[PDB]
Ligand binder design. Structure first.
Ligand SMILES: Nc1nc(NC2CC2)cc(N2CCOCC2)n1
Length: 154
């Protein structure tokens, strides 16, 4: 059994947009925009809503780029994160009570201030390859196991 989450990376030819999470789960780390998928909305719908909520941005089209399953030791539910990509954004990103958005050059991505798994799968995101990932965490900092592969269908 797993719970659905979304994650949205606005990835342009020279830069990626990230947000500093100000409260809640993952506070103090840069990440893409996303969160819990709600009852009554598609996964992509949930992805658009969290992007609008956390950055004010809306998007013409979202593209499926990956799926990452997380297990946390001692927690019965798995985290199933659907990762989306997009180039063209509508609007200017602005701080919310969840996220302080900033653009990053692609050689200055702050992996040390991100979730530790991102160092593993973000490269596949940059090569525009679809991927499936699995990470077993102890706490929120320690990866104990992981698998990562390229897929033809996310
Ligand atoms: N890039 C990334 N790495 C994560 N690592 C797992 C917590 C250990 C979680 C996560 N998000 C989870 C919540 O919804 C947004 C995506 N995003």
């Amino acid at each position: 059994a797993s719970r659905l989450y979304t994650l949205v990376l606005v990835l342009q030819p020279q830069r990626v947009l990230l947000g500093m999470k100000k409260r809640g789960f993952g506070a103090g780390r840069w990440n893409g925009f996303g969160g819990k998928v709600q009852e009554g909305e598609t996964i992509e719908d949930g992805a658009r809503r969290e992007l609008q909520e956390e950055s004010g941005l809306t998007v013409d089209a979202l593209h499926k780029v990956g799926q990452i399953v997380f297990e946390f030791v001692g927690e019965p539910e798995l985290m199933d994160v659907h990762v989306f990509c997009t180039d063209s954004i509508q609007g200017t990103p602005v701080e919310s009570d969840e996220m302080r958005p900033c653009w990053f050059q692609l050689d200055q991505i702050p992996f040390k201030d991100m979730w530790p798994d991102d160092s593993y799968w973000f490269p596949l995101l940059l090569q525009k390859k679809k991927f499936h990932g699995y990470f077993k965490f102890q706490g929120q900092d320690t990866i104990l196991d992981y698998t990562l592969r390229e897929v033809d269908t996310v």
